[PDB]
Amino acid sequence: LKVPPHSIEAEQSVLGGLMLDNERWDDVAERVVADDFYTRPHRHIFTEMARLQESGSPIDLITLAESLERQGQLDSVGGCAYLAELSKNTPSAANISAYADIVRERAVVREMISVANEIAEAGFDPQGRTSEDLLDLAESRVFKIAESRANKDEGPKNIADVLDATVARIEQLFQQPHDGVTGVNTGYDDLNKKTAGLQPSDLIIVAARPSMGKTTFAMNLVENAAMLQDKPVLIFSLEMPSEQIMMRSLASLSRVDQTKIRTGQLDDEDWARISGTMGILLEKRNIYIDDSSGLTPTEVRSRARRIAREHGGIGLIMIDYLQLMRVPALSDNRTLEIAEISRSLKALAKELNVPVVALSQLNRSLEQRADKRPVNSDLRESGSIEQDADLIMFIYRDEVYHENSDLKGIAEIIIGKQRNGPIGTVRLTFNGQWSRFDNYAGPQYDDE
Amino acid sequence: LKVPPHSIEAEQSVLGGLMLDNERWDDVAERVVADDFYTRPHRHIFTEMARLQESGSPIDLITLAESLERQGQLDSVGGCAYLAELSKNTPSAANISAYADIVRERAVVREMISVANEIAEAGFDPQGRTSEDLLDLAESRVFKIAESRANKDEGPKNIADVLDATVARIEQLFQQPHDGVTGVNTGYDDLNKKTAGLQPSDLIIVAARPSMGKTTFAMNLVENAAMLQDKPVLIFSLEMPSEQIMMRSLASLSRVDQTKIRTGQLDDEDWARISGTMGILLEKRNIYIDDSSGLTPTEVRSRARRIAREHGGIGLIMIDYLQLMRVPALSDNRTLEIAEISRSLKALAKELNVPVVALSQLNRSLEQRADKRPVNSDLRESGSIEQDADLIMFIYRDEVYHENSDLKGIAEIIIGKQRNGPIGTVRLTFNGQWSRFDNYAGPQYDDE
Amino acid sequence: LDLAESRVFKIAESRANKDEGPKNIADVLDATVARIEQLFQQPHDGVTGVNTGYDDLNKKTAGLQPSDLIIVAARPSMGKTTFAMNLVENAAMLQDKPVLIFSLEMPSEQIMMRSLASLSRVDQTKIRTGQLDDEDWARISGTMGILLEKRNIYIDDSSGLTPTEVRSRARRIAREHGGIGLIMIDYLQLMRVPALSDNRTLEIAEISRSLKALAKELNVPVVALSQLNRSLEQRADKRPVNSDLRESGSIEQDADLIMFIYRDEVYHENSDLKGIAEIIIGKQRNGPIGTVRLTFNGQWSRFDNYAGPQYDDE
Amino acid sequence: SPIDLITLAESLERQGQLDSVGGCAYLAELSKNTPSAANISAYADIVRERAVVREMISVANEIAEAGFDPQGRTSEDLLDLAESRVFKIAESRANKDEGPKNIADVLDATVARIEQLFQQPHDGVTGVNTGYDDLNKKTAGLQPSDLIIVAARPSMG
DNA sequence: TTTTTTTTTTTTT
Ligand SMILES: Nc1ncnc2c1ncn2[C@@H]1O[C@H](COP(=O)(O)OP(=O)(O)O)[C@@H](O)[C@H]1O
Ligand SMILES: Nc1ncnc2c1ncn2[C@@H]1O[C@H](COP(=O)(O)OP(=O)(O)O)[C@@H](O)[C@H]1O
Ligand code: ALF
Ligand code: ALF
Ligand code: ALF
Ligand SMILES: [Mg+2]
Ligand SMILES: [Mg+2]
Incomplete structure (x- = not known):
């Protein structure tokens, strides 16, 4: 006797929360209906609650008991004792939304089970219906379930x-x-136009061959976001220590030779620029860095939650980089480990609703092609990264692979994947002297 | 005990008929397989019969019995007595097709019952899986039954x-x-004469060197087709943004300077012509545009299928252009990529029974020959393009190569290939200012 | 050990060599x-195989011999399919056994229209456009009556056909009609082998080997078409040779007869051989190679015996 | 989701694991026995301490068993195994910093x-001098902590 | 289950 899946506790909690907090009826009204309650008395109680709310009366123990008694259904549910128990057993109405979601889950599963039972009954007794007829019946029954998917444009x-x-x-x-900038500003006109800023809850993967300025581009984006927002931003520099990252940031901000900064060959003017940059940074205090090695996804998630709770959210997250993250449980298969890391980071981005720039690296096969402009498949373990990634931006430099290139000082940011916007190339001026990217002010080349 | 539906008599009839006639094996083979039989002994017997057939030996009581005994399966299936009973119980093999179809029906019904039971059991015990996982499982399982019964030939x-x-x-x-134009009207007299219009199922290729108006002639053809039919047209502008394509279309239709539209220098007359064209198009609403680049053949096929289903077919499809489409699986082999793209688009054209005008680019080696008139070998990444193409039109403008040309303002469409017609040249008047091609009304040059 | 080896020798090879x-x-x-x-x-008459219906071709080949692979190759638009369908029609009309066609390249409709244009000697353009007069309609009706009398031709336009599927269908037709007189495949590179899909050359080689094995099994000629490489057009002389095949390696090595179609008119607008097509038999296991001239009526989409002066073969 | 008695109990029941953990009665006992979560950090640290001690004991037992039964392994192999096992535990605690x-x-x-x-x-070189003026200028010497890879075809020096 | 290596045969430029 396999009982249909259900949750007495969830229904009792929802009913008690409604008895306690009427204001959360709407949050429950959208999620569940009267039929979703597995037990008939709970269906009756929810129907009476809906009737009272529609009439505008408050939902409490006394009013509900009176209304049910007037209908003669009070005995069917258990009276003041049972309703008082329903109100009593709920730990809190603050989680009534989760209970409603669980009840909806149970209702959908029961609907699926009933659909399967109907299809099986039809199979046992075709009643002269052709195989095509039975298949169409099953497909029509299943399509009712998939109403909450759609396809959009x-x-x-x-x-x-x-x-x-x-x-x-x-x-x-x-x-x-x-432009119409709505998301976190990228600091560049064309990139903001094509992306409308770094969309919250969306996973962004910046990829490039090593030495292409991947980390440089990510740091420039993070610094621009910090200077263009007050919410804190977060960086996980597994690849490099915090010292080198901070030196790169200061060199970019001050527009001073990073070689001088590293070597300490700093003059009075450069020193004054550095002091001003330091003052600005210590004024902001909206950047956080972790120089941990071999971080697992759970550690990153916990630390991000800590920082968000302390400072009421995070403006931006940065990870350097995906292939460094470790999952000891899935160490046996590298591809599964990478896929799980990507999925966990995407879930983290959705939960925190913050842009997450997680860096990735390409297989050497890219350089075997006549044209070295990266594409989506060029990612290492592209199987899962490409699927999870909402935005994919590749960094290319023709000057790197051709010393006689006419595009010297020009870096190509190619948006190869964008769910909610167009793909295409963008140009930026790369100053390797300062390790910085700037808006491309040169002649516009037709995007052919 | 709800036994799965079955027809033992049909199985016995099929087996006996095969024992009585080997020639009707194929009819049984195309209809049923070994696993379809409800009883495992019948499955083993059918498998052994298939093994005998692969060896070419005659299928009979003794040969089958020996084959099963050599595998130690004789007494497992009921012995030689069971096989003799099966052979005796079958009068004739005339109705063997009906019995095989009955067995197939019962097997597929049992398959449906099994899938429904599996779905119900999974619903009962998600084992921590989310709902959508179970829903997708159900969809995939049903689709497997739907696609399995596929005599699609x-x-x-x-x-x-x-x-x-x-x-x-x-x-x-x-x-x-x-008027001899069987396919969709092209709007050009000589082209229609030489081709009878763009026929259904064809994959037409138009090629030209850069700056030759490659897209211009194709857009003029699409305009003529859409204005002369009720079916919709779809344009995949992988090359240029939709804005520029629409501006060129308006310039051609209203014969307004493309420079004016691009710069906005529209006067009252030009604005009135543009408004009339806009009204005509808004009355039509038979044009659809997609400027997404790097599209796989799969995406083009799906997007064409959507239009065909929504609007009851397609009149014409336009692609600008072939060399921009991307196949991730064969990305590392450009020749294989082009072959796959071309073959898939030809199959799409055939399946939709609609012309698909897809553009392509030529090679520089053409310019090195004495005669600059393009041929098939001059195409870039050429291997499969010609071999898959049906009608190939090369656009030639001597004015681009010779400012002393006697044919200024004239463009030659050379038929490099026509399976169902002759080859030759068609001269047209090219208005670059308006970006249009028109029937050439000047002196007629007889083809050599 | 020697005794055991001899004892086993008395069994295994002794029994194997008999059967x-x-x-x-x-x-x-x-x-x-x-x-x-x-x-x-x-x-x-000397034409042991299925009669090709052409004088010089029959003389040089003695008809399409059983069990042999014939590869008709040409650049696109050279009438490869045209010549193949002409041969199929001649074989069907000159024999009682059925023929089977695999038109992966084109739908059955276009091939049938081409065949009707060739047989009735009617313009392809008129048939396509439906601008047919009474005489053309009468000719087409007569051809239809002849074909419906013969009932010895079968066509399949299914795409993505694997060699195994082709073999199965050929066996089916042979059993239905006690064999096949000829098989036609249009064309090789459109066949699919999912197992060797990774390496195109291995796929083509397996396809060629499977078709040759099928031809040997059914004891019937199998004419399969193919397409050439563009490097041919980079040479001074554009007359095709064996190397010009696309995915070339296996094909020639499996082929018994190879016929390349050349048209000087196509590449030379001022050609003195207008209307003349050169079928170059470049490979023949049991006979001599050489060139043959035919008259190509593209209006009717037909190949006919060349009745003009014979040019000495240098 | 919120971690509570009801949601946790139903989540375990969805995997059939509720009765494996003592059931709703055991969950209610766990919820009741805790007065407050103020000292939760200390309890977590204590649990970590006990787990690490058990891990150390397990590693010691495994090393002792291997010593008793090398199974043909030389002493060096066993000592290296013990080295790796101890180093793993030592590295596993780098979670506070x-x-x-x-x-x-x-x-x-x-x-x-x-x-x-x-x-x-x-003088421009902040690290190990490479001994070459241009290379030192471009690299400022071989920096500490940095991995340097020199590559070329064989026989290139 | 994947990354490498590096044969071999083709195409393309
Ligand atoms: N002093 C400098 N002058 C010019 N370019 C520099 C200088 N310092 C660093 N760069 C550039 O910055 C880039 C950063 O490299 P790296 O961070 O390793 O790439 P990625 O982070 O993309 O893997 C290098 O490719 C280098 O060309
Ligand atoms: N109405 C016509 N007038 C003259 N020639 C024609 C006509 N229709 C077709 N043709 C010729 O028939 C040939 C058939 O081409 P096609 O079958 O593609 O060649 P292949 O099969 O060798 O690739 C074309 O090259 C064309 O010149
Ligand atoms: F080499 Al890097 F980020 F600096 F991949
Ligand atoms: F163009 Al074809 F056979 F008609 F190669
Ligand atoms: F690779 Al060497 F000497 F280091 F041959
Ligand atoms: Mg980096
Ligand atoms: Mg052809």
């Missing part, structure tokens, strides 16, 4: 939208071409 | 039926006058 | 003499 | 270190 915009956009742009060419 | 076709279909289609064509 | 294995020269000579006396008993 | 605690101290320390490096008037 896949790209095809009709002629009317094209005309509207064309007219708007032709008119705004005379006007000011604003 | 028309098989060998006698010439009589093909002749009848061809004659019916030819008579249908002869019925409705179309 | 199979190395055939002693006596049986081979007996079979050869039987075949020779079979030819002796049957007076023929 | 190396974290992104309040940045202000870290920034001050890093800036102070940078100032210290500046004050030391080196």
